[PDB]
Design an enzyme around this catalytic site. Structure first.
Site, PDB file in Angstrom:
ATOM      1  N   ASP B  10       0.870  -1.187   0.000  1.00 47.95           N
ATOM      2  CA  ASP B  10       0.000   0.000   0.000  1.00 47.95           C
ATOM      3  C   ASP B  10       0.907   1.237   0.000  1.00 47.95           C
ATOM      4  OD1 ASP B  10      -2.182   1.793   0.484  1.00 47.95           O
ATOM      5  OD2 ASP B  10      -1.942   1.554   2.654  1.00 47.95           O
ATOM      6  N   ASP B  12      -0.265   5.024   0.944  1.00 48.80           N
ATOM      7  CA  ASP B  12      -0.540   5.915   2.068  1.00 48.80           C
ATOM      8  C   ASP B  12      -0.548   5.169   3.398  1.00 48.80           C
ATOM      9  OD1 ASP B  12      -1.418   8.520   3.322  1.00 48.80           O
ATOM     10  OD2 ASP B  12      -3.099   7.216   3.862  1.00 48.80           O
ATOM     11  N   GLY B  47     -12.679  10.598   5.819  1.00 53.88           N
ATOM     12  CA  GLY B  47     -13.520   9.554   5.263  1.00 53.88           C
ATOM     13  C   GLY B  47     -14.743  10.088   4.543  1.00 53.88           C
ATOM     14  N   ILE B  48     -14.588  11.256   3.929  1.00 49.48           N
ATOM     15  CA  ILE B  48     -15.686  11.938   3.253  1.00 49.48           C
ATOM     16  C   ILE B  48     -15.364  12.119   1.766  1.00 49.48           C
ATOM     17  CG2 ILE B  48     -16.932  14.150   3.118  1.00 49.48           C
ATOM     18  CD1 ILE B  48     -17.789  12.264   5.405  1.00 49.48           C
ATOM     19  N   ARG B  50     -15.146  13.830  -2.001  1.00 52.47           N
ATOM     20  CA  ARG B  50     -14.632  15.138  -2.388  1.00 52.47           C
ATOM     21  C   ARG B  50     -15.733  16.195  -2.403  1.00 52.47           C
ATOM     22  NH1 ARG B  50     -11.866  16.944  -8.202  1.00 52.47           N
ATOM     23  NH2 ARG B  50     -10.025  15.762  -7.515  1.00 52.47           N
ATOM     24  N   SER B 119      -4.353   5.369  -5.449  1.00 52.96           N
ATOM     25  CA  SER B 119      -4.132   6.765  -5.836  1.00 52.96           C
ATOM     26  C   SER B 119      -3.710   6.913  -7.298  1.00 52.96           C
ATOM     27  CB  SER B 119      -3.065   7.398  -4.949  1.00 52.96           C
ATOM     28  OG  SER B 119      -2.658   8.660  -5.467  1.00 52.96           O
ATOM     29  N   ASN B 121      -2.182   9.281  -8.292  1.00 52.38           N
ATOM     30  CA  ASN B 121      -0.961  10.069  -8.199  1.00 52.38           C
ATOM     31  C   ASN B 121       0.249   9.245  -7.775  1.00 52.38           C
ATOM     32  OD1 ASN B 121      -2.464  12.582  -8.718  1.00 52.38           O
ATOM     33  ND2 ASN B 121      -3.277  12.265  -6.656  1.00 52.38           N
ATOM     34  N   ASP B 173      -1.941  -0.529   6.167  1.00 54.88           N
ATOM     35  CA  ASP B 173      -2.163   0.134   7.458  1.00 54.88           C
ATOM     36  C   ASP B 173      -3.641   0.323   7.801  1.00 54.88           C
ATOM     37  OD1 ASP B 173      -2.347   2.131   5.367  1.00 54.88           O
ATOM     38  OD2 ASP B 173      -2.460   3.635   6.955  1.00 54.88           O
TER      39      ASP B 173
END
Ligand SMILES: [Cl-]
Ligand SMILES: [Cl-]
Ligand SMILES: [Cl-]
Ligand SMILES: [Cl-]
Ligand SMILES: [Mg+2]
Ligand SMILES: [Mg+2]
Ligand SMILES: [Mg+2]
Ligand SMILES: [Mg+2]
Ligand SMILES: [Mg+2]
Lengths: 227, 227
Positions: B10, B12, B47-48, B50, B119, B121, B173
Site C-alpha cells: 500500500d 498511504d 472519510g468523506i 470530495r 491513488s 498520483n 495500514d
C-alpha cells in the site's frame, strides 16, 4: 493443486442459530424475579458480557439494589442451566438449510471436517442436532485463551485435524470470525451480506454446496509455479 | 516451502503519509474563498467524498448558496491541483522509517516488489520520494472498478508481477486494506495497533524488516504434506 484436507465450521450462525435460545433463557430468569423483558429489550443484551447483561435486566426492573454479586452469580447459574437444557432439546430441524447435505457430501469425498466453536456447549449441541458423526475433530473451547478475531480457535481445529491451516477452508458468519480464519492462514468463506475480507462470500448457508466449495478450492489453490 | 515471489505495498500510511497534504490543500482552497478551517475541522473531512468535503467547508463559512455545482467543480479542480503540486514537492525524507532499507533489502534478495495503491498520483509520489527504482510493477489505479476492501487492486498488482496471490505478501495500514489483501489470497501484514485479520501484525513501519518478513514467510508457507 494443493490438496484440500479439511473444512472447518463455526457453530453459531453457520450450523445452527442459538441467539433466540440465549434470549429466551434471559427472559425466563427475568420473569422469575418479576421483570418483563421482550425481544426489543434484547438488543440491549446484544454483544454484552454475562454480568452486564444481568445488570441491565436488573436496572430495567429497578432491582439492582436487591442482589449482591453472590446472588447475581446464583441468577446467572440458573440462567445458564436453563439455556443449556434448551440446547439439549434442539432437534435435527434446527440445523441451517444446506448444512446436513454439505456435511454428507464432504464425508463422501473423504474430506476431514473440523469444528472451531468458542462455545463450551458445542458437543452437547452437535449431539442434539445429530451431527456428531460428520465431524473428525472439534476444537476444545475450554482451553481457549483468546477468542475471535484471534486465530487461536481455528489454529486449534487445524492442529487437531493434523494439517496446516492453508490446506483448510473455514466457514464463518461474523466479521471477527472471518478475521480469525484469515489470520490463521486458512482460506475464508463468509456467510452473509456485509462481511469483508472473505475469499468467497455467500449470501446464506443454502449457497454452501460441495461443488461450489470445490470450484472455489480449485481456483484459489492453483499455482503455475507448482506445475 | 513455497517460494516468496513478491512483496506488495500500500502507499498511504505505509510508504508515506499524505493526510496532512490533503488537509493543507483543503485549507488553502477554503482560505481563497474567505473561510478559515483548522486541523480540528479536518476530522469532519475524514472519510468523506470530495464533493461532500467541499460542501462541509462551504457550510462552515455560510457559503453554500454562493457556488453552484459547476463553480464547486472549479474549486475542486484547484484544490486537487494544489494537492498534486504538493505531492511533487515531497522529498526523500517523507518516506516512513524502515521503508527504504526494507526495499533495498528486498531487491538485494531478488524479490519482486509491487505497488497496490488506489491513488492516481502514485507514480508522481514514488518519483518525488525517489523510490521508483525499487518497484517491479505498480497497479494502475485509473483502471480500478472497486476500491478496498475489494481485492481488485491487490489482484492487479499480483497479475502485473506475473505470480499468484498466495506467493505474495501484502502490507497495509488500514482495515479495508487488510481485508482486501486477505480476500485476494495474499499473505497479510498489518501496520498499526487495532487491525484485525492480519497474519502478521506490527506496531509501525520500523518493525518491518527483511529478516522478520522472511521468518514470517518461512513459518506460514511450510506444509508437511509438500515435503
Ligand atoms: Cl460457536
Ligand atoms: Cl459481524
Ligand atoms: Cl494509497
Ligand atoms: Cl482502519
Ligand atoms: Mg457464528
Ligand atoms: Mg434429541
Ligand atoms: Mg494506507
Ligand atoms: Mg524532488
Ligand atoms: Mg489468507
Amino acid at each position: 493443486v494443493m490438496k484440500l484436507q479439511g473444512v472447518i465450521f463455526d457453530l453459531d450462525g453457520v450450523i445452527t442459530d442459538t441467539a433466540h435460545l440465549h434470549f429466551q433463557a434471559w427472559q425466563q430468569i427475568a420473569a422469575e424475579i418479576g421483570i418483563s423483558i421482550d425481544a426489543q429489550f434484547n438488543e440491549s443484551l446484544k454483544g454484552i458480557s454475562r454480568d452486564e447483561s444481568l445488570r441491565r435486566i436488573l436496572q430495567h426492573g429497578g432491582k439492582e439494589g436487591d442482589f449482591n454479586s453472590q446472588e447475581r452469580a446464583q441468577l446467572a447459574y440458573r440462567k445458564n442451566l436453563l439455556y443449556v437444557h434448551s440446547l439439549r432439546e434442539l432437534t435435527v430441524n434446527a440445523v441451517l438449510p444446506g448444512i446436513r447435505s454439505l456435511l454428507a457430501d464432504l464425508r463422501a469425498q473423504q474430506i476431514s471436517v473440523g469444528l472451531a466453536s468458542v462455545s463450551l456447549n458445542a458437543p452437547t449441541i452437535l449431539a442434539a442436532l445429530e451431527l456428531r458423526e460428520f465431524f473428525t475433530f472439534c476444537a476444545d473451547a475450554s482451553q481457549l485463551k483468546n477468542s475471535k478475531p484471534d486465530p487461536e480457535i481455528f489454529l486449534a481445529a487445524c492442529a487437531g485435524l493434523g494439517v496446516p491451516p492453508q490446506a483448510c477452508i473455514g466457514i464463518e458468519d461474523a466479521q471477527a470470525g472471518i478475521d480469525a480464519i484469515n489470520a490463521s492462514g486458512m482460506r475464508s468463506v463468509g456467510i452473509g451480506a456485509g462481511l469483508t475480507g472473505a475469499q468467497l462470500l455467500l449470501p446464506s448457508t443454502e449457497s454452501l454446496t460441495w461443488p461450489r466449495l470445490s470450484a472455489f478450492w480449485q481456483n484459489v489453490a492453483e499455482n503455475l509455479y507448482f506445475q
